[PDB]
Amino acid sequence: APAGRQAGQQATVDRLRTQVTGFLSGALGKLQALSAQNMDPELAQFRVLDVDRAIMPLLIVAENARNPGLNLVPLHMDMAEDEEVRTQPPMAGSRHIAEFVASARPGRYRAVIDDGSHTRAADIRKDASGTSVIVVDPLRKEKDESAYVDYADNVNMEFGEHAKCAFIPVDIQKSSFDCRILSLSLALKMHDKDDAFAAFHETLRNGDPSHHVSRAQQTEELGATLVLDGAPLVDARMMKHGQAASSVSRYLGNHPEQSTVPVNKRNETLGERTTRHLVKRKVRNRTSGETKEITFSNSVEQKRIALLNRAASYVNSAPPPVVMRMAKLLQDSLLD
Numbered sequence: 001a002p003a004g005r006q007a008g009q010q011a012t013v014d015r016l017r018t019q020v021t022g023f024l025s026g027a028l029g030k031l032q033a034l035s036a037q038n039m040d041p042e043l044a045q046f047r048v049l050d051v052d053r054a055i056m057p058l059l060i061v062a063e064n065a066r067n068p069g070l071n072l073v074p075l076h077m078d079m080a081e082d083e084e085v086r087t088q089p090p091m092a093g094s095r096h097i098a099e100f101v102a103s104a105r106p107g108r109y110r111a112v113i114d115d116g117s118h119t120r121a122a123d124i125r126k127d128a129s130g131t132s133v134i135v136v137d138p139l140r141k142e143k144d145e146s147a148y149v150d151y152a153d154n155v156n157m158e159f160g161e162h163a164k165c166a167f168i169p170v171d172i173q174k175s176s177f178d179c180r181i182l183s184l185s186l187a188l189k190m191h192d193k194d195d196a197f198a199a200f201h202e203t204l205r206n207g208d209p210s211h212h213v214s215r216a217q218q219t220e221e222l223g224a225t226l227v228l229d230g231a232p233l234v235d236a237r238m239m240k241h242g243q244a245a246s247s248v249s250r251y252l253g254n255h256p257e258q259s260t261v262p263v264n265k266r267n268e269t270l271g272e273r274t275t276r277h278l279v280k281r282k283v284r285n286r287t288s289g290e291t292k293e294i295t296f297s298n299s300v301e302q303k304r305i306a307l308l309n310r311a312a313s314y315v316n317s318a319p320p321p322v323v324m325r326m327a328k329l330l331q332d333s334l335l336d
């Protein structure tokens with residue numbers, strides 16, 4: 001019974017519980033309906049950017065509780081604090097990296113890093129020796145691979161010049177609004193490959209990345225690591241939600257050994273699973289005009305739905321202090 005754990009607040013708790021599940025499940029029902037009807041959300045006038053920003057802090061709480069040791073913390077870069085450049089304010093509970101590095105208790109963390117307009121995933125190690133970070137970006141649209149040099153340097157400068165850093169840009173995202181669900185999934189995959197990421201942190205502080213990645217280079221300015229080929233650290237299980245079939249196939253062509261390993265309990269290969277998620281629909285054009293018809297994997301929209309399902313279930317059976325916390329995180333999203 002929960003009457004013992006309610007501290008006489010069963011009225012406020014029970015009402016905040018309904019309020020949070022109502023929003024999570026309310027978003028779930030529309031997204032499930034749009035996905036089942038094979039319709040693009042932004043063409044259907046669903047404001048995914050705002051829903052993804054409001055549910056994210058609540059998803060992390062659920063994921064942190066579902067997998068202890070994930071230690072997933074939302075963080076943002078300095079440019080995210082600038083109301084002039086940013087397209088959206090950082091999500092509720094988000095911390096400035098400088099504040100985090102200075103005050104975070106030593107240990108292992110996962111993170112989603114908002115720069116104001118885009119979000120990446122990260123694996124952070126903080127101890128006496130220093131802080132080290134492995135950043136995986138689900139977007140790779142830069143035409144010339146020199147912006148990644150800047151990104152790697154820009155990420156290192158945000159964590160401190162004494163931090164060891166690796167920047168891994170990966171061709172997963174194709175849409176404009178999926179960078180939050182993709183980064184959240186990469187974080188979960190990081191905790192899944194915890195051992196492999198710890199051995200990379202070790203090599204970062206000490207030799208040859210060849211035991212961990214296929215292609216890497218130190219940057220001229222800060223000597224941070226830029227990885228333009230993350231395999232095998234970036235394996236098939238990290239490429240599952242690649243939206244373009246050409247990205248998954250190019251990746252498998254470059255790393256054939258990843259084409260036969262199981263990516264889930266159903267024993268699907270990366271290629272089998274992506275094919276199962278291929279849909280054909282109209283999307284917004286980013287000549288002429290407005291829309292274009294494409295064939296892509298709806299894995300991310302299915303994953304957004306599956307994550308909302310998890311969170312809504314967690315809250316239904318969550319203890320009051322968790323309910324209070326998630327209700328506040330939702331209210332805090334209407335600030336800024």
Ligand SMILES: O=P(O)(O)O[C@H]1[C@@H](OP(=O)(O)O)[C@@H](OP(=O)(O)O)[C@@H](OP(=O)(O)O)[C@@H](OP(=O)(O)O)[C@H]1OP(=O)(O)O
Binds near residue numbers: 237240265303
């Ligand atoms: O990474 P998680 O969020 O922790 O969930 C993953 C995973 O999800 P991803 O697609 O993002 O990698 C699988 O999902 P699918 O391949 O089917 O899409 C899987 O499912 P199955 O093995 O049953 O096929 C199962 O999730 P669940 O048990 O809730 O259905 C699994 O969980 P774990 O990695 O924690 O074991």
